[PDB]
């Protein structure tokens, strides 16, 4: 996150850090004691060396660490140039007992619509400057949902954002999630509700003609359910 502020330590107990040899790759949100929802494009990886770390603020510090028993990509997932259905569900090789620092974020209803204008945030440990290095500490950013017809404008996403994608804006020119931030949960509204999962941008994180975009959770709540076995 470029231009975010540090979170209060442990104020977002649902954050996961998906890592490869203790090196952080993407965020993820904990949607059940045994499952973390992240972005599919994060998993283009040798799974043996992957770990989920839970309960974190400082990135180099223990936290609760889990092995992954199964990485389930959305069935209709298409990578770049498509980058469609960019979700994957990671299964923990243990089971979380909720606590003060580790706790799951609830799913939205399937009927939830994320209307333009919605006030949201987005936490992540990703880069804090173009070309730079990951954040030492979990940070956050305020994001407003823009109108999709308008992000699809030829100068912006030029037609390529589908109904399941939520287009986003900071308050400023110079704030943007960035390398390392995908998989992070977009939460919206007063009651801080799960709304999306970060997916992509363009190469320059703050590019104003390429607002960041996340995948709405609601349209995939059903699948999340079937996969996680609950209802």
């Amino acid at each position: 996150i470029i231009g975010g502020r540090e979170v209060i330590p442990h104020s977002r107990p649902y954050m996961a850090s998906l890592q490869r040899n203790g090196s952080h790759l993407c965020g993820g949100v904990l949607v059940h004691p045994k499952w973390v929802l992240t972005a599919a494009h994060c998993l283009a990886q040798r799974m043996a060396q992957l770990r989920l770390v839970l309960g974190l603020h400082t990135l180099d510090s223990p936290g609760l660490t889990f092995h992954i028993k199964a990485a389930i990509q959305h069935p209709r997932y298409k990578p770049v140039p498509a980058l469609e259905n960019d979700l994957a569900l990671l299964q923990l090789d243990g089971k979380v007992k909720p606590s003060r620092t580790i706790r799951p974020l609830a799913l939205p209803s399937k009927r939830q619509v994320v209307a333009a204008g919605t006030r949201c945030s987005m936490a992540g440990w990703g880069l804090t400057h173009q070309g730079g290095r990951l954040s030492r500490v979990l940070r956050e950013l305020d994001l407003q949902v823009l109108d999709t017809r308008m992000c699809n404008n030829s100068r912006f996403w030029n037609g390529s954002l589908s109904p399941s994608m939520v287009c986003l804006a900071a308050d400023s020119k110079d704030q943007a999630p960035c390398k390392g931030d995908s998989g992070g949960p977009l939460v919206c509204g007063k009651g801080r509700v799960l709304a999306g999962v970060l997916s992509f941008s363009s190469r320059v994180c703050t590019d104003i003609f390429k607002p960041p975009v996340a995948t709405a959770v609601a349209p995939y709540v059903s699948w999340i359910r079937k996969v996680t076995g609950r209802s």
Binding site: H41, V80, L83, S160
Partner: peptide, 4 residues
Amino acid sequence: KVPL
């Protein structure tokens, strides 16, 4: 699209 550069995925993050």
